[PDB]
């Protein structure tokens, strides 16, 4: 199952992960793709915040869903 993430710059990232994996693991995949640490990147879906102790399955996300990401700031 593959899903697309949305960045603050307006860019949809393409990644491949399983629903049984943890949100923190998906964050690591993001770090290697864009070049930003996981602890400074948040993942939001539907309107609720996703915790590193929870998994994508807990938010009924499947291959084809668009997930949002919002953490770390450059300016002020």
């Amino acid at each position: 199952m593959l899903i697309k993430v949305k960045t603050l710059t307006g860019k949809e990232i393409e990644i491949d992960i399983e629903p049984t994996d943890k949100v923190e693991r998906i964050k690591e995949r993001v770090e290697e793709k864009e070049g930003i640490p996981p602890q400074q990147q948040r993942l939001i879906y539907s309107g609720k915040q996703m915790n590193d102790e929870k998994t994508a399955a807990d938010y009924k996300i499947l291959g084809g869903s668009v997930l949002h990401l919002v953490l770390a700031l450059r300016g002020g």
Binding site: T9, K11, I13, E14, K33, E34, G35
Partner: protein, 52 residues
Amino acid sequence: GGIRKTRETERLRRQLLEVFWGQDHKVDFILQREPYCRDINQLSEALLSLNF
């Protein structure tokens, strides 16, 4: 300036591995961001290498 990302970006794109311009999503990302160095990378690399 001092250093440029043009060498890593075009080398990836030409024959080497996806380095700056490369790194999967990064390929287009260099120019489509804000800095000048990245700007040249996709601009000069993605445009000239793909078209020519």
